[PDB]
Design a protein around this ligand. Structure first.
Ligand code: N6L
Ligand code: NAG
Ligand code: NA
Ligand code: NA
Lengths: 11, 28, 251
């Protein structure tokens, strides 16, 4: 339901 | 912070939000 | 938030969203109290009855938001957590006594029109403002009803309730580390926090210095917006010595 956030924040 | 609690788009520009007056009116 | 309205842009620039990395979902609200510290409810991070026990790497904080679900490019800022601190006497077993936690960010967040800290009360501001009938403001992206979800941040203004009325509304044991707020059935107006609003702020605008202070943290309620029930909020000032101890030691 949420727009994907930039990958930089999920590393 | 010395600047806490002062909103850029409201207090810092002397603009009020649409319902803050309701709070003020309750502070009797 | 039940029976609130859409926030204005920049209305609550201390608002924080606690965001679960995987699955990507809203976990709770929170608030920005400095460039490196975020305040929330302990139960957002630790609640064994629901098998909740998050570690730092499980979570992100999203600051400057308005839309619930959208990635607000060039507006919101996303921060990683360095460390979580839960009050050592947080009572998850019984009644959420001392429902407070701090999160230190890995890096300072840059302030902007959309991102700015709220003040924490002093004893005098708390004494002056935490009075029955005085209204505060609750914000969050939680559910719109007990039994759906908002496009943008919601806001509701609610009066603090007399302690005996709070006590008489529930079988749960209330403590001095809590206060309750909401309208009475005979008052007509409505509104409450609800699921997903946990951890967000209850704020008041001091009429003495025109600054916003965070007096409460969305903590607990029995249903949402039920007649004769009230929302319960962590009493921030009562727990401020712990806040200061943590920031002084770990800042
Ligand atoms: N119903 C329960 C009642 C409850 C209170 C204290 C101990 C256990 C259960 C509740 O409230 N609990 C369970 C854990 C998290 C918390 C919660 O759900 N908090 C969010 C909340 C806050 C407000 Cl102010 C108004 C509505 C709601 Cl839904
Ligand atoms: C919560 O998680 C921490 C670390 O994983 C653990 O030490 C603790 O015992 C867990 N359960 C609690 C605090 O109830
Ligand atoms: Na009671
Ligand atoms: Na109610």
């Amino acid at each position: 339901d949420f727009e994907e956030i930039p990958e930089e924040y999920l590393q | 912070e010395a600047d806490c609690g002062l909103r850029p788009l409201f207090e810092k520009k002397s603009l009020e939000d649409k319902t803050e007056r309701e709070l003020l009116e309750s502070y009797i | 938030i039940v029976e609130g309205s859409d926030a204005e842009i920049g209305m609550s620039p201390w608002q924080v969203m606690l965001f679960r990395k995987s699955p990507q979902e809203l976990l709770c609200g929170a608030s920005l109290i400095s460039d490196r510290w975020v305040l929330t409810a302990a139960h957002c991070l630790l609640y064994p009855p629901w098998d909740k026990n998050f570690t730092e790497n499980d979570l992100l904080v999203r600051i400057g938001k308005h839309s619930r679900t959208r990635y607000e490019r060039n507006i919101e800022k996303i921060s990683m957590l360095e460390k979580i601190y839960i009050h050592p006497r947080y009572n998850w077993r019984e009644n959420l006594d001392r429902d407070i936690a701090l999160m230190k960010l890995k890096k300072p967040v840059a302030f902007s029109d959309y991102i700015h800290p709220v003040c924490l009360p002093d004893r005098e501001t708390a004494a002056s403002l935490l009075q029955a009938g005085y209204k505060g403001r609750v914000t969050g992206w939680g559910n719109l009803k007990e039994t759906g979800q908002p496009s943008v941040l919601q806001v509701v203004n609610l009066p603090i309730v007399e302690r005996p009325v709070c006590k008489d509304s529930t079988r749960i044991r209330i403590t001095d580390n809590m206060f309750c707020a909401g309208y009475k059935p005979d008052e007509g107006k409505r509104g409450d926090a609800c699921e997903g609003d946990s951890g967000g702020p209850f704020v008041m605008k001091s009429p003495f210095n025109n600054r916003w202070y965070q007096m409460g943290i969305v903590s607990w309620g029995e249903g949402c917006d039920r007649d004769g029930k009230y929302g319960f909020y962590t009493h921030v000032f009562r727990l401020k010595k712990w806040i200061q101890k943590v920031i002084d030691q770990f800042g």
